[PDB]
Amino acid sequence: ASIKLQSSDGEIFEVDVEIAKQSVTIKTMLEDLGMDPVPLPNVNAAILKKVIQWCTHHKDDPGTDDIPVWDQEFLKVDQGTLFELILAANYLDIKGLLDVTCKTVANMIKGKTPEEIRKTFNIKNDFTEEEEAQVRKENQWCEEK
Amino acid sequence: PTDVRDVDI
Amino acid sequence: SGRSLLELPPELLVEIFASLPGTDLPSLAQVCTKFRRILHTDTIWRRRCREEYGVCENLRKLEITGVSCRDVYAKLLHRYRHILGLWQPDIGPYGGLLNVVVDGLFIIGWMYLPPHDPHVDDPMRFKPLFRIHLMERKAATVECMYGHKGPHHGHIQIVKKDEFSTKCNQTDHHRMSGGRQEEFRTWLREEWGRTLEDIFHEHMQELILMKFIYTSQYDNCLTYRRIYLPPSRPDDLIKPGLFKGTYGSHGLEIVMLSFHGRRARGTKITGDPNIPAGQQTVEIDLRHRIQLPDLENQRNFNELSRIVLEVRERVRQEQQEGQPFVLPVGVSSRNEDYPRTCRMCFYGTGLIAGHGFTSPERTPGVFILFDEDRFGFVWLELKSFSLYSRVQATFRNADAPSPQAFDEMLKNIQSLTS
Ligand SMILES: [Zn+2]
C-alpha cells in the first residue's frame, strides 16, 4: 500500500504504491533496485508535494491534447515552479505531467513576437548586431502574406 | 434521339 | 523558484518547440543564440510538415537532394499555402476541376477530367497541369506541365485567399509536329475516345470543336477560383460529393451533390454553353417521394407525367400559401446500362436554357436513387434521362471551413457565370 520517498533536502513522504509507480523512475528504483526509501536527489520537497498531488488526482485514468481544468488550476503557479515541474516530471518519467506542463509553456509562446517571448521568460538578447540582422533575414519568410 | 432539345440541360 | 526556460535541456526544448505551430518557430529563433541553434534541428520541422500539411518526407530523399524539412516548410509549404486545395478554373461556361496538392518536394496541380461519354462509371482521368519544385539552396521553381514536350517554365500568382492564376511562358511546348489538327485529334482521343468520323454527325461535332477551340485559347493561362467539397451529415443525408453525369450531346459533366435541409442540390463543376459551370443543374425535393409502380406502369410515360405534374402542383400550393426499375417508353438515355433496380424516387426540377444561358428555367422531373453512389434524373419535358455516378477519387485539402462557407462558395461560383 505505501512506500517512502526522500526529497533532495531529506524530507520523507509515505506514498501509495500505485500512485508512486506512475513515475517509471520510481517504479524502477523500488522494484529493480530494491530501494526503500527512494532517494530523489533532484527533486525537493515543495515540488515533490505538487508531483504527488498531481499523481494522486490522476491515479485512475485512461489522455487528450487539451488541458483539463483541474490541471490548469494546479499549474496556476509561478514560472520557476512550472519549470521545476517540467524537470521533475522528466526525471521521474511521468508522461502525463510532462505533457501538460510543456503544453502550458507552449501556450505561453503561441503567437508572440521575439520581444514578447523575451519579456515573458526573461531572456536576454544575446545576438551581436550582425547575428541579429542575419536571423531576421533567415526568418522573413514568415511574414509572406 | 430527342436531340430536338436535349442540349438545354 | 528561480528556474528559467533557458535552463531546460535541449531535448526538452526540442519537444516543446516541436509541439508549436511552425509559424511560431521563426519568432522563437530570433529570441536568442540558443533557440536559433536548436531550431536547426530538422525533426522539429519534419513534424511541422506532417501535422500541418500532411506530408511525411523521406529521409533518404532529403539526403540525396540536399533539402531539409525546414526548407520545405518555409519555401514550399508556407510560401504556397494559399493555392492548396480544390479549384474551379474560369473557362467561360466549361469550368473544370483542379486539386492542388503536396507530393514530396513538389506541389502539384492535378486537372481531373471525366471519362469518355457515356461511361459515367469509369474513373476520372487526371493529367498534371503545373508543378512547383524545391531543390537545394534555391527558391522553388514553377513549371507548366501542359503539352506533350515535358516540364517548362511557368508563373503562379496569388491574388486572394480564394483565387490564383497560372501563366505559361514557353507555349511552344503545347504545340505538336503534326500541327493544330493533331492537337485536336489528340485532345479528341483523350476526351472522347473517338475520331473525326464518329463525331462528324453532327451537332456534337460542332459543340466539341467549339469547346476545343475555346478552351485551348487559354494556352494554360488560367485563373482558378476556390471550391469546397460538401459537409457530410448523419441521419439527415444520403451521401454528398462529386459525380460524373450525362448531359446529352455535351457529354459528361461533373456535378456536385450537396444537402440543404429537405432539398438536395446538384451544382455544375464543369458545364456547357446552355447551363454553365457554377449553376444549379438540379434540385431534389426530399419531402416529396414518388412511389414506383410495377414495371408495366413505369413503362407508361403519361402515367409518369401526370404523377409528376400532380406533385409540382401540390408543391406550388405549399410554397404559394429496392425494386425493379425501367425508364418509360420514349425517354432517351445515352447510357443504356442504367441500373435496373432502384431504392427510391423524389420530385425535383432541373435548370434549362438555350445557347448562351438564355432565359433559364426550372422544368419538372424525377430523381431516382439506385445505390449509395448512382442516381438519375428524368427530364420530363425533354423525355430524357441523365445518369450520374460517384467520383471515387479522394481529394486532399478540399473540405470547407464550415457549412456557411460552403453555401457562400456556391453563391460565388454561381454569380461568376450568371
Ligand atoms: Zn506550358
UniProtKB/TrEMBL annotation, chain B:
Homology family: Belongs to the cyclin family. Cyclin D subfamily.
Segments forming a coiled coil: none
Intracellular or extracellular location(s): Cytoplasm; Nucleus
Full-protein residues shown: 117 to 125 of 125
Name of the protein: Cyclin D1
